[PDB]
Write a protein that binds this ligand. Structure first.
Ligand SMILES: [Mg+2]
Ligand SMILES: [Mg+2]
Ligand SMILES: [Mg+2]
Ligand SMILES: [Mg+2]
Ligand SMILES: [Mg+2]
Length: 213
DNA sequence: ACCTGTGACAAATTGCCCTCA
DNA sequence: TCTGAGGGCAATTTGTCACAG
DNA sequence: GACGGCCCGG
DNA sequence: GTCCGGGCCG
């Protein structure tokens, strides 16, 4: 039914820091780009609102503030860094935004790949819970199940978690427990996990999931 | 020294509301 | 009249650190 | 602000 | 009474 996002594993595993609104827009950019190019995409306020169940006003606010906050953002592929945009965004017409994605990023967008339908992610709120759902999809099987062990240092680096989550009780309480709850409540996935320890330190997290269909 | 969890507070983000070209 | 670009809001979540054990 | 029905006057 | 054309309004 819904638009089918596919992306290079290099992006699933890239290091960057984007908000929920920015990541929502990035899914549509990757969709335009892949159907073809020169990096130039476009966003209509009224279509965004319908896709994500917003009013026109709040869609306008979300697009406007998301687009200004891209300035200065980098993406790092492991170790190579690029800016997302190489020119500011602009409105040719009322309700329309035109954007210039760094053309050197196209090959990184487009066989080791990750794929999910846009409806799977459109209710998630915390952007770190979006990062986690993409990584698990990367290991999904046709029947929708999978199992993967992610190393904690790699999570902190790739998703760029904030500094106080280097204390493990804060990592548990404000990132791990919250994002596993969102996935279980807001997606069709059913997710469980266990901690892997070495001495007194927890080093990896092992995720198992299956599909509710 | 290390490990855990919880209570407090600060800062950020959420869906809402109203105006007006 | 419908759109969307502005200005705001309070209630909640997310980010930080002191303290018990 | 942009777009379409509607009532004016010639 | 009718009609093409503008141009104000919801
Ligand atoms: Mg944030
Ligand atoms: Mg918002
Ligand atoms: Mg939550
Ligand atoms: Mg006591
Ligand atoms: Mg003691």
């Amino acid at each position: 039914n819904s638009p089918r996002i596919v992306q290079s594993n290099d992006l699933t595993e890239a290091a960057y820091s984007l908000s929920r609104d920015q990541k929502r827009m990035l899914y549509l950019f990757v969709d335009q780009i892949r159907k073809s190019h020169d990096g130039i995409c476009e966003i209509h306020v009224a279509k965004y609102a319908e896709i994500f169940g917003l009013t026109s006003a709040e869609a306008s606010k979300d697009i406007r503030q998301a687009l200004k906050s891209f300035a200065g953002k980098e993406v790092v592929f492991y170790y190579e860094s690029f800016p997302w945009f190489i020119k500011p965004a602009h409105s040719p017409s009322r309700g329309l935004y035109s954007v210039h994605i760094n053309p050197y990023l196209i090959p990184f967008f487009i066989n080791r790949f990750t794929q999910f339908r846009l409806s799977e992610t459109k209710e998630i709120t915390n952007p770190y819970a979006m990062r986690l759902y993409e990584s698990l999809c990367q290991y999904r099987k046709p029947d929708g199940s999978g199992i993967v062990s992610l190393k904690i240092d790699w999570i902190i680096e790739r998703y760029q978690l904030p500094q106080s989550y280097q204390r493990m009780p804060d990592f548990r309480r404000r990132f791990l427990q919250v994002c596993v709850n969102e996935i279980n409540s807001r997606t069709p996935m059913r997710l469980s996990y266990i901690e892997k320890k070495k001495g007194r330190q927890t080093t990896h997290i092992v995720f198992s999931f299956r599909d509710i269909t």
